[PDB]
């Protein structure tokens, strides 16, 4: 505490901040700033970065949005905030409880992404993911680090702008969704041309349909190829995405509403909703990062003790190099069982292997959720303290029995929310939907938020 809160002190006094609005800003003024704000971000999502030629490869940067001013994306800011609340929630980091120390705390959480901004960039430069610093030198690195710094720097203020009532909601959520929505529509109307041995044809599934339906004499063959490309977007992958969209919308609204009231004023009835997806998308996210590196880690491990049956039984690995680039697949063992199918038939071929993965994938997210809550500071006790801090209380209950009533649902809404999170994510992964089950939930959630604000404003707008 002592050597962390005060270390921030010298720098937060010089860093800038956005001003409080004097009064409650008009909605039609909120919309103006939001649309402006979103447009700028979107522009950053396309401008190519300056001076990157060696490797990411240049031709893809023409296709791509990899390599844009958003190259490091909003990820530093999100990772900055999570790491804080993660340590803060666990009590590992102590947060000054006063608003002024909280206002600095905001700057501290802002400071991490700015730190993460340089840190993540350095990883990509040295490794050659833009190219060797010898090739670029200090000057080109100077600009690239500065630009990657400014974009996240801009992105930060723009979110803080919306966060402080100059717009609607928050930028980061708006930004991540706009990416998700764009990817879906792009992959349906992309005018890109693919150079095949069958000829030149368009990428966008909707565009590709009418281009093919006229370009092919075999109109049944169009019915087949158009909807079943195995290396390109298909109208099915649109249909798969649409079908999931509805179901998430249904299960988005699941929530257990607990009655609460102010312990200081009569009536004033309100409610605290325990949302079924109580743990957001964090559980599976942490689970996926675990699995991915378990594949990388096993690859390096299994090349040194392959002759030991235990290391093989742990997980085997090979090098698929026939034609395409050398890609690392597992050959057997646990990691083989911890892998998803790549084709529908593969599930049929081994019935056991599929159930072993699914139980892992449902159990992992569910178990992640249950364990995540306690650390994250969202367990009943922490929730009850927030309600106590706000002077709320369950009618007819003492402050202690609140914890008993909250534990009826929160610990279970944790696990079942995670299990539901994974299960729908299996469908997203299995049926080739775009953006994974994590992405659609993010998209539906955010659009839902703006909608319910939007309707409230429409009451008098």
């Amino acid at each position: 505490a002592i050597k962390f809160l005060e270390v921030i002190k010298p720098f937060c006094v010089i860093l800038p901040e956005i001003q409080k609005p004097e009064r409650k800003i008009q909605f039609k003024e909120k919309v103006l700033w939001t649309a402006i704000t979103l447009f700028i971000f979107l522009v950053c999502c396309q401008i190519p970065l300056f001076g990157i030629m060696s490797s990411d490869f240049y031709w893809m940067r023409v296709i791509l949005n990899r390599g844009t001013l958003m190259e490091l994306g909003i990820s530093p800011i999100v990772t900055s905030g999570l790491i804080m609340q993660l340590l803060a929630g666990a009590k590992i980091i102590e947060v000054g409880d006063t608003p002024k120390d909280r206002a600095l705390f905001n700057g501290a959480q802002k400071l991490f992404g700015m730190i993460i901004t340089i840190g993540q960039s350095i990883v990509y430069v040295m490794t050659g993911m833009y190219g060797d610093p010898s090739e670029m030198g200090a000057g080109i690195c100077l600009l690239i680090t500065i630009q990657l710094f400014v974009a996240g720097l801009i992105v930060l203020l723009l979110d803080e702008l919306l966060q402080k009532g100059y717009g609607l909601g928050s930028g980061i959520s708006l930004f991540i969704a706009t990416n998700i929505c764009e990817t879906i529509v792009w992959k349906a109307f992309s005018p890109t041309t693919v150079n095949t041995g069958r000829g030149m044809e368009f990428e966008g599934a909707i565009i590709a349909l009418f281009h093919l339906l006229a370009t092919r004499t075999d109109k049944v063959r169009a019915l087949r190829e158009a909807f079943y490309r195995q290396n390109l977007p298909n109208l099915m992958n649109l249909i798969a995405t649409i079908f999931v969209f509805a179901v998430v919308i249904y299960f988005q609204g699941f929530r257990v509403d607990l009655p609460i009231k102010s312990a200081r004023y009569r009536g004033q009835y309100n409610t605290y909703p325990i949302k079924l997806f109580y743990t957001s998308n964090i559980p599976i996210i942490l689970q996926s990062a675990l699995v991915s590196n378990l594949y990388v880690i096993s690859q390096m491990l299994s090349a040194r003790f392959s002759g030991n049956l235990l290391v093989s039984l742990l997980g085997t690995w090979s090098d698929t190099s026939s034609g395409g680039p050398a890609r690392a697949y597992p050959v057997g063992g646990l990691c083989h069982y911890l892998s998803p199918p790549e084709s529908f038939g593969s599930v049929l071929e081994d019935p056991v292997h599929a159930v072993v993965y699914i139980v892992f994938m449902l159990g992992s997210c569910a178990f992640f959720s249950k364990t995540w809550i306690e650390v994250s500071g969202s367990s009943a006790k922490d929730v009850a303290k927030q309600l106590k801090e706000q002077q709320m209380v369950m009618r007819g209950h003492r402050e202690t029995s609140m914890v008993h009533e909250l534990n009826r649902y929160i610990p279970t809404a944790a696990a079942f929310g995670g299990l539901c999170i994974g299960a729908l994510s299996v469908l997203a992964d299995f049926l080739g939907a775009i953006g994974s089950g994590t992405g659609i939930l993010l998209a539906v959630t955010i659009i839902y938020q703006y909608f319910e604000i939007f309707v409230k404003e429409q009451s008098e707008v």
């Binding site: 999100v78 999570l82 102010s262 004023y265 942490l286 306690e374 650390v375």
Partner: protein, 57 residues
């Protein structure tokens, strides 16, 4: 529980960190009023009980 979490934090870096999500909040508040009032009876008097009866017949 704290050991397993840290290992997740380490793996989030590098390639797979690009996939992430958003945070959560629940705060809320309401209006305040402060009127008051409470009645009682109205006092009486005139009991009439003097004592200095000195007859100067």
């Amino acid at each position: 529980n704290y050991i397993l979490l840290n290992l997740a934090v380490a793996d989030l870096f590098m390639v797979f960190g690009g996939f992430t999500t958003t945070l959560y909040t629940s705060l809320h508040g309401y209006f305040v009023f402060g009127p008051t009032g409470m009645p009682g009876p109205t006092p009486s008097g005139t009991n009439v009980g003097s004592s200095g009866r000195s007859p100067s017949v």
